[PDB]
Paper text:
The PCI domain is a conserved bipartite domain comprising the helical bundle (HB) and winged-helix (WH) subdomains initially identified as the principal scaffold for the multisubunit 26S proteasome lid, signalosome (CSN) and eIF3 complexes. Yeast eIF3 contains two PCI domains, one at the N-terminus of its eIF3a/TIF32 subunit and the other at the C-terminus of eIF3c/NIP1. Taken together, we propose that one of the key roles of the a/TIF32-PCI domain is, besides building the eIF3 core, to contact mRNAs in a non-specific manner and promote their delivery to and/or stable binding on the small ribosomal subunit.
The crystal structure of a/TIF32276-494 was solved by single wavelength anomalous dispersion using a selenomethionine (SeMet) derivative and refined to the final resolution of 2.65 Å. The asymmetric unit (AU) is composed of two molecules of a/TIF32276−494, which corresponds to a solvent content of 45%. Although the first molecule in the AU (chain A in the pdb file) is almost complete, the second molecule is only partially defined in the electron density map. The helical bundle (HB) is composed of three pairs of antiparallel helices with structural resemblance to tetratricopeptide repeats (TPR). Interestingly, residues 337–362, which form the loop and the helix connecting helices 3 and 4, are not present in the structure of any of the known PCI domains. The winged helix sub-domain shows the canonical α-β-α-α-β-β topology with an N-terminal elongated helix, which is kinked at the beginning. R363 and the adjacent K364 together with R431 contribute to a positively charged surface on the concave face of the protein, proposing a function for this region in mRNA recruitment (see below). The results indicated the formation of a complex with the stoichiometric ratio of nearly 1 (0.944), the dissociation constant (Kd) of 158 nM and a relatively large enthalpy change of −10.23 kcal/mol.
Numbering used by the authors: 278 to 341, 345 to 493
Amino acid sequence: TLANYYENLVKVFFVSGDPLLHTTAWKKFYKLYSTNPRATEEEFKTYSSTIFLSAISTQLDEIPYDPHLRMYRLLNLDAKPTRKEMLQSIIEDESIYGKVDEELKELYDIIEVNFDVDTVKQQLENLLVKLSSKTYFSQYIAPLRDVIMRRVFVAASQKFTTVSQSELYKLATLPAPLDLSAWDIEKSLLQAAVEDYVSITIDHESAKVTFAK
C-alpha cells in the first residue's frame, strides 16, 4: 500500500524535526485517501485540519549542504519546500481547505495575516479552549507554541532596546495550553538567539533583557 508507506513517512518526519516533509507526506497520503472510496467525510475533516495545523505550527524558515535531497526526490519535490508556500498550497487546495475546521482558519488569520504582540493573548484565549477539544491538537501544541513565541520575540526585538524580564516574559506568555513558565520562556528566547532570529543579553543582575541591533 502506498497509503501505509506515506503514513509511516509522516511519522518518521514528525520525529525527525523536518515538519515540512511531515505535512508534505500528509498531503501525499490525503490525495490517496481522496482517490479511495472508503472515505468518511469525518476522516477528511480530521486529516485536513491535521495537515493545516501541521503547516501553521511549522517553525519559521531558517536560512542555511542539503541532506534532504533524496527525501525531496522520494516525495517528488523539485526544490526545498517553504513554510509560506506550504501554507499557501493548503489554502488554495479546496479538497483540503474546505474540510479544515474554522478554528484553524481563525488561528491562521491571527498569527499569519494580522499578528500583533499587543493583542495575541486575548485573541488566542478562547480559541485555544475550543482547539483543546480537538483530537488532532495535542501533538502540535509544542511546535505551535514555539512559532507564536518566536513571532512574539522578533516583534519584541524591534520594539525594545532594554526591557524587564517581567514585562518581556509576561508578554511572551501565551494563554491556555501554550503557557510556559518563566524559565522555559527565557530558554525559548535563548534558542531564538542561537538561531540568529534575535541578538540579546540575558540574566543581567538587573533582571532585564537587552535587544541589540
